[PDB]
Design a protein around this ligand. Structure first.
Ligand code: NI
Length: 108
């Protein structure tokens, strides 16, 4: 089951030592439906963060892929910053977080 890596770095906000989570969801249209095909969460206290999904090429073949990246604070169930972009396998994909207007004090 040969695999290729969809990976890169997440940056673009300063966490300043605050405990955070990054939730990365990889989307693809699978027979015409937009679906999450993979998800990772990372616990971090600074950026940038290097990420990687190792996915079967059989699963990736022919697919547009989209990466949804969401920063939250640990202890607060709310998105503080996020990114949405098309990505491609085997490419170092730079994810640049965009702060919400309510950052860093967004609420659940
Ligand atoms: Ni950075």
């Amino acid at each position: 089951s040969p695999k290729v890596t969809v990976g890169g770095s997440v940056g673009g906000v300063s966490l300043q030592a605050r405990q955070a989570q990054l939730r990365l969801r990889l989307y693809a249209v699978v027979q015409g439906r937009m679906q999450t095909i993979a998800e990772r969460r990372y616990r971090v206290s600074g950026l940038p963060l290097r990420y990687a999904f190792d996915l079967e090429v059989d699963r990736l073949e022919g697919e547009a892929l989209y990466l949804r990246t969401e920063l939250s604070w640990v202890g607060v169930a709310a998105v503080q910053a996020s990114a949405w972009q098309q990505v491609a396998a085997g490419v170092d994909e730079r994810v640049r977080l965009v702060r919400r207007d309510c950052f860093p004090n967004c609420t659940a």
